[PDB]
């Protein structure tokens, strides 16, 4: 039972583009790239080779196939040992999911800050461009269940864990400048509403559903959020092409004890990129797993994720100076008002070992500061504190969470706490309290100083009675969804105007999409209008009436908002389907895979069947994948070089993954006589732009491929796709 | 700085004896004292001095004294997150007690053997008179909670985990030969009628309760080990002072596949020594902790515990030649019938640094085996193959309990088996399956062999109808307890007499006590009367007529089940209070402390208040204990020097001391005028058998009271205890 | 049957003093007794007389001592479910003790008030003297695990869960009028210095060692109550004969919105009464369940606890 | 044992037998019933052992397994039968 005797089974321990080498664990694959964090998890790396099959308690196992039992048609036998640890074994394998953002995907990699910035955060990660910080870095959808699908319509969670000199630092964030609620003690609501309904336990990874819109219509705060979702935003292409946010305005405390606030972004150096609806839909079926994937390969293939730390700052002085309340995360600042200032870079650079026991065990918490940094009365934020650390006692068996190993500093830690479940670390301390004498006191204390000192809180004013109430400062919910509205583009305003008529089409009682359309008139008539027109709904005299909400501190935009207001494509990492035939003209594929190198994007080469091609020049072209095994969903442009077109000018699959491609907004590539492919695209001789067009794939054929790549889809096509039946 | 500035904070990290030092972690203690278990742990061994105070996640702490409020006299807010991982972290501390044996204390130690056993088992701990294993032991008692009391009476727990090159082996034993039931399918019964009983939870650490007695009376098969539990086997000295048991036939396997039937048998170096019930009893009171104590202090003095492993042999061909089964946990197997053969020997020498972490988290389970060993159809052996690692998926939190420092084998262990709760190895394998081509289907399965071989099970023959059956062969209940009884000596029968008849005053139901009293004619007349008369029981007609049980393969008696007709004294160890006065003659002192030094046995210098007293010649003599303080139940024999007798002559706390001693058969010696205390015990005047007396504390003073120490106690004073109120 | 012909297995379902009969299940030995939280627990008390032995499946048992095996001498076979749901149930009965007051002995009552307290407060409980608000009641020591013995040298915890027409209210108080430390940030240092210390856990149910004193030398706050702890408060004749405290001021508030501060007291009927040294720590030893069997007994006799 | 949390998952409600259920099981995390019997152990004479074991036969008894007859070494063998 063994690998073949061409070593085929196993990866080379190289960078290799998607689809070349069966994937695997990171320590296999990318021996060399270490970092303090992946070195210190050599205690447990456990390898395999050469070794033998063993007891848990290290017997040696002579018979893996067969239970004990008297006679060999006879009954199992209790004193089966061997049977019963690895049936035992099995059968307590699941620990309870996150109670959201159950389905993430993670790696590792390293962050450095590009300057010190010890005039405004003495934090020590901060403080040197060339100390180096091991991540580890978990993206997430938030709704469904870990076993749920990558490309639904929802936000995404992006979480690091920094692992400093002076303490682990988790930026728990979004990849949404904002949040739906703006009291912890609605986050259960909230969650509730969004979540599958609980007598059914439908609908899945989806917020197209009575309850969420119930919620959401009597819950004007939520209505910023919600646009965001609504919007191309809700449906990325990878996790290397959105952007993160930190919410919360948090501080930043320097050695003279100087506050700073502050926001937390990620910019992703790949680019802003989203799928459309469709697509998105569609992928949940072909590829359920499509961001997973996607993301492990790019780190396989080189392409690794790298992301920009920035930071809005913004003085004590200016807290009030917004018309916004500084502390309501149901509120973005524009960039416009307060820019971000470039802070640092990271970049994910490993695959984990085993997804369990890293990506599934990890656990982030936002209360996990380090000396520099502090907290803000973000009554959200307050909330968050009560529960991260909660949560880890039942989902990671009790206390000790921490010293799973993907959870462990890598700085010293020490102190009187004892026992819980699952204690690894073996105390010799004589103390396990203090003050005490009998261990002079250690471990002690450090008083707060410049670095390396002990934490203390910014000693902020609090001045009020104890209530439970919301700050009249946060009941304002119209002004920023009409901002984020009126800085998309028009496509994108489509977009948005057809996620909320899809989702609101699938809430059975017709009142609570009629009291959604009313919430949309107070935001934008132009919008509101657009849904109702689809719902089949008419807006009232009054509705019509509605005064839009003002403008953010003068602004009418603010571009910053859009995916694609701004071009910044970059299309190293994106894949392009090449539709092979039978009798491939090698010249052409020749110049294909030549400037798609040349820029750093991968080729998946399809055909009718699996197995080889042979090219016009007796080069054996391997088949990576099947027009329908691996269809245009899964990649950002289609290329159909010349040969023996008549191979697949009549195949369905054939014609249809470029009907597919051509919907979704795709480049499309068609050289020689795959010209004549023009026909089931309905699209004229004199061309289009969006469709690259030939006698041969040359230099300027692909310069022309790649150029529409970088701007990402074809936006000028959209008023052509309503008539394509695909 | 709180420590005191002479250092007499931390204790010499050499050998003290008990009472000279303050106890420390091990490693602390004895860091030159080393195996490849203590080794082994090494890397999760946490040390304090020097190290910074911190959370968890590494952050220096700068107030460990108090919460982040607002204003110091404010409510404490939610944002205190060191607070709240610190209370998190105590919140969990506790994990579930075992369901039995939850009182226990365990020391690391080795094992070697006294030569190559390969002709009768492939066992590669037994291969090699070089090949040393390191072990960790847990004693322990049976019914009560961990925080219940040493001395009860009750069976002892003997469970040592051998860290072996080919797995770990657990001998998982009693301190008796044989059980109290035949099938694991009553131990719940058994257990519960044991433990506290379910209304109101009373009593703790004792069977001295109604529903024991009902079940026993009820269940006659428990009578042989109720009958060791009622001797002075239920009440040892130490656990360095007891035998142990596997208790079940087990099988070894050699090279050639030949099975030999072997009983497992620890022999304790130190010999062979219990407690009398008055003393063990308030025992329980003065010091609930004394057996706990007494064997860590014993490792700190040097004076580690010794045990020789032996083996009764029994040929396969030989499996029916007793009159009872070889099967039959009830019963056991003479000495005179089958000898035991000397095997190894066992020595603990560390104590652990964390009792939570190594001695809480220990888990010892029969089923671990190893090739060279393997089961019979024992059918409470059996049954107990189900239970040990079920029940440590709750009491140590799911299935990779194998992974907590103390259980982990130091030898190579490698499987398919993943996750599951606070998983710690990351496998970095392709597969997690075989047979599998992607790893090359490693790790592998190993053939059995003579050496490094799989494991694989004797190819016993098994013939019948499936059953819920009794062996009819087990249905003999009475003809062993009878055995165990006539082997005993005279005052060690009265001690069983009196173990059964306080046993049953408590219990309330008088019914009950008839029932049992009858089991006990059906065993020995002489025996039942007994108990009988000091329950007002008067034996019918009918009972005093129940012939005897036949003799067990002919022997009337067998002494090695006696604990004292053949002496097995060392006095090594054993501890001597010394009681002061303040003016002591220095030269008694002098020759006590130089005799009891050059034999081992330690003294406690005791007096009526703390700090020092002065010697006739100046010598400044410093006090460990008060009378009360350090009461005669803990120490070994009592020795009063000369002196300013008048001193100590009427404290009522000095005269009890002596009475007390007294009554417990302990050796007393009495110097000069220290014999005025001849009157306190009622001593004629020219002396008796047990106290040692003399105008001085020499010539050959201490020879006497030490070889009174080497027989342990002074049974012929039995006759003369009654008349003393104390 | 294997019950006694005189019936004399069974204690009469009336009230008894002490060692008159055996002590029993409360609903078995005072059926009538009876309050609105007692009546409450009907649907989950199960009997067991003149039933069937089952599994837990309700599969009737027809041999309950022996295994299945392949002959009587046989292995024990995997497909006996019967053995394996009893065996696994009884590898999983215990739970953690609790991190403190792990030992502790309890009983159901009741309360009432003197009189309305609307004056002063809302809460409903006080409302009305004719309001009787069932109550369960938990007293226990601090430091020792629930196998410990009772009559130590500890504070005595004193917690009482009143249950009210608008929620549960939870009493959980000591036997002392003050605690040894001001901060909770404290706490886990207070509470592992007066534990088995950490190497050897030793010793249990006592505060003689040296980690207590070290933090107590160190920690002037605890010395209050370590006078407290010190003197014969520390060692009760009784749970019956014990004050309680609530020791925080807590407040009240009124229907007016008037607060008012108040701490909390427990008042025995029964008197105040404590053992010597020498006598508890000997019981300890003699019977390490004295305060819970005493508890028990006086219910069972009659004796019952009163506090006001 | 892990997945609802313990041995009483047979007093989550809709894993609840509806004929009755009563023995000598007790306590477990999440215990639900509220045992009265003065045993749990039999036999017992303090509860004149009830519940009591109920001998096989047409209806309302006990379980008991078909004696069905075994016979072999013990082996970890695949039958050939199933090769
Ligand atoms: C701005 C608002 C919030 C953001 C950006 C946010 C972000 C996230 C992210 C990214 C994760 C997944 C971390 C991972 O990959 O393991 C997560 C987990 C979680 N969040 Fe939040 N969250 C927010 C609000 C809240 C609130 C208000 C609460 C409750 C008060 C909460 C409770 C949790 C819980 C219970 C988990 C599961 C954590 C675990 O099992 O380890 N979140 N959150
Ligand atoms: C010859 C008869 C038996 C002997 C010599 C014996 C011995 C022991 C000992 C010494 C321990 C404590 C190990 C330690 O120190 O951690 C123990 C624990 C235990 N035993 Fe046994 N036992 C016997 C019968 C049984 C039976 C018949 C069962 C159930 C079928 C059983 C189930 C248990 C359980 C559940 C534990 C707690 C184990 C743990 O929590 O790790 N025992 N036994
Ligand atoms: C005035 C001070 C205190 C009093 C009067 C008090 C009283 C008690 C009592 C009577 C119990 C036992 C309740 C029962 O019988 O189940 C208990 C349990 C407990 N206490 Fe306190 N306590 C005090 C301070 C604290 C502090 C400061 C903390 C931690 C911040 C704490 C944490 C606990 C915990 C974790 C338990 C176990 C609760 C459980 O498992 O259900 N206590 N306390």
Same mark, same amino acid.
């Given at each position: 039972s063994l690998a073949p005797e061409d070593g085929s089974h196993r990866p080379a321990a190289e960078p290799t583009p998607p689809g070349a080498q069966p994937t695997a664990p990171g320590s296999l694959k990318a021996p060399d790239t270490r970092n303090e964090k992946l070195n210190s998890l050599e205690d447990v790396r456990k390898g395999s080779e050469n070794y033998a099959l063993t007891t848990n308690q290290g017997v040696r196992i002579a018979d893996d196939q067969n239970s004990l039992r008297a006679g060999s048609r006879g009954p199992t036998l209790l004193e089966d040992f061997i049977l019963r640890e690895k049936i035992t074994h099995f059968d307590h394998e699941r620990i309870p999911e996150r109670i959201v953002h159950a389905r993430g995907s993670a790696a590792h990699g390293y962050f450095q800050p590009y300057k010190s910035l010890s005039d405004i955060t003495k934090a020590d990660f901060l403080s040197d461009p060339n100390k180096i910080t091991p991540v580890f870095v978990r993206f997430s959808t938030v709704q469904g269940g870990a076993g749920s699908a990558d490309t639904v319509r929802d936000i995404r969670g992006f979480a690091t864990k920094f692992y400093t000199e002076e303490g682990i630092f988790d930026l728990?964030?979004?990849?949404?400048?904002?949040?739906?609620?703006?009291?912890?003690?609605?986050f259960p609501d909230f969650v509730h509403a969004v979540k599958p309904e609980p007598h059914w336990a439908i609908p899945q990874g989806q917020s197209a559903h009575d309850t969420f819109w119930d919620y959401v219509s009597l819950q004007p705060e939520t209505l910023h959020n919600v646009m965001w979702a609504m919007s191309?935003?809700?449906?990325?292409?990878?996790?290397?092409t959105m952007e993160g946010f930190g919410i919360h305005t948090f501080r930043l405390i320097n050695a003279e004890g100087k506050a700073t606030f502050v926001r937390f972004h990620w910019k992703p150096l790949a680019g802003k990129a989203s799928l459309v609806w469709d697509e998105a839909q569609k992928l949940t079926g072909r590829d359920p797993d499509f961001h997973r994937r996607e993301l492990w390969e790019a780190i396989e293939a080189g392409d690794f994720p790298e992301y920009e730390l920035g930071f809005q700052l913004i003085p004590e002085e200016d807290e009030f100076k917004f018309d916004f309340d500084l502390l309501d995360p149901t509120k973005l600042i524009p960039e416009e008002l307060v820019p971000v200032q470039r802070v640092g870079k990271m970049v994910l650079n490993r695959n984990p070992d085993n997804f369990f026991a890293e990506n599934e065990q990890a656990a982030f918490h936002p209360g996990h500061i380090v000396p520099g940094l502090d907290f803000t009365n973000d009554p959200l934020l307050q909330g968050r504190l009560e529960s991260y650390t909660d949560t880890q006692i039942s989902r990671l068996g009790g206390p000790n969470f921490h010293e799973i190993p993907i959870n462990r500093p890598t700085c010293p830690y020490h102190n009187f706490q004892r026992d819980g479940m699952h204690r690894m670390g073996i105390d010799?301390?004589?103390?396990? $309290?203090?003050?005490?004498?009998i261990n002079d006191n250690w471990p002690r204390e450090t008083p707060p100083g410049p670095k390396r000192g002990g934490f203390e809180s910014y000693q902020e004013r609090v001045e009020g009675n104890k209530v439970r109430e919301r700050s009249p400062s946060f009941g304002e919910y119209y002004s920023h969804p009409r901002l984020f509205w009126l800085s998309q583009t028009p496509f994108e305003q489509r977009h948005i105007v057809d996620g909320f008529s899809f989702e609101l089409s699938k809430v059975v009682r017709p009142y609570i999409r009629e009291r959604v359309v009313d919430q949309l008139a107070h935001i934008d008539l132009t919008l509101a209008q657009a849904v109702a027109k689809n719902l089949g709904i008419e807006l009232t005299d009054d509705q019509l009436n509605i005064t839009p909400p003002p403008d953010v501190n003068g602004?009418?935009?603010?571009?910053?908002?859009?995916? $694609?207001?701004?071009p910044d494509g970059d299309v190293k990492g994106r894949v392009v389907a090449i539709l092979l035939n039978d009798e491939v003209r090698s010249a052409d594929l020749l110049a294909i895979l030549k400037a798609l190198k040349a820029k750093g994007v991968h080729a998946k080469l399809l055909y009718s069947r699996m197995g080889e091609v042979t090219a016009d020049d007796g080069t054996v072209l391997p088949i990576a994948a099947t027009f329908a095994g691996a269809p245009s969903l899964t990649v950002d442009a289609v290329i159909v070089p010349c040969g023996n077109i008549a191979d697949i000018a009549d195949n369905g699959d054939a014609n249809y993954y470029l009907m597919e491609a051509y919907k979704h907004l795709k480049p499309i590539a068609l050289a020689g006589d795959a010209r004549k492919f023009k026909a089931t695209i309905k699209?004229?001789?004199?061309?289009?732009?969006g469709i690259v067009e030939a006698d041969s794939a040359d230099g300027s054929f692909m310069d022309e491929l790649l150029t529409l790549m970088a701007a990402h889809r074809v936006w000028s096509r959209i008023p052509k796709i309503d008539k394509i039946p695909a």
């Open positions: 728990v964030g979004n990849n949404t400048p904002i949040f739906f609620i703006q009291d912890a003690h609605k191309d935003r809700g449906i990325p292409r990878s996790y290397r010799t301390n004589p103390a396990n $309290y203090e003050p005490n004498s602004l009418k935009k603010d571009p910053s908002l859009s995916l $694609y207001a701004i699209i004229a001789d004199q061309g289009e732009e």
